[PDB]
Amino acid sequence: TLHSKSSQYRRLRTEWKNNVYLARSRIQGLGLYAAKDLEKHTMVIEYIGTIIRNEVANRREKIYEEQNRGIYMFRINNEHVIDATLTGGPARYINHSCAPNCVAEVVTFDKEDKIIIISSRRIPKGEELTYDYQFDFEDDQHEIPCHCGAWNCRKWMKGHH
Ligand SMILES: Nc1ncnc2c1ncn2[C@@H]1O[C@H](CSCC[C@H](N)C(=O)O)[C@@H](O)[C@H]1O
């Protein structure tokens, strides 16, 4: 079926290169933009990387912090993180917004769990892609100023300089 989840994912693997482009962000550093008008609830790009445990992720983040380099991770849940720092794709440049246009959802395809960035509304060509990073207050991580610039911006987020 053309509109099934598995078919959407299969189309994603061939189309994602045409959905997005990397450019200077209107938020911070580099960001990811819609290369074309994207319909609502459409799969945009997969957050690829290496699935690791919290223990492993915290040890990696220390390693990275000692280098002059960005850290690129997506937390799936309390147990696992996708580390995109070494093996990620352009989805790792997607910035946080307190008022985002995309959502990240787990999708299972041929025996694997995947994080797919999905539009939560129509996105015009040239608009920056964002999702909400999901920083819970219960300690866990550090936190930096948020510069997403939205009206309801919580002024803080999880991350690094
Ligand atoms: N709304 C926002 N406000 C401030 N910093 C942000 C942000 N969204 C993303 N970032 C920064 O981007 C990182 C997440 S990865 C996003 C890619 C990053 N902009 C880059 O050019 O490499 C975090 O370390 C954070 O510092």
Ligand SMILES: [Zn+2]
């Ligand atoms: Zn914000």
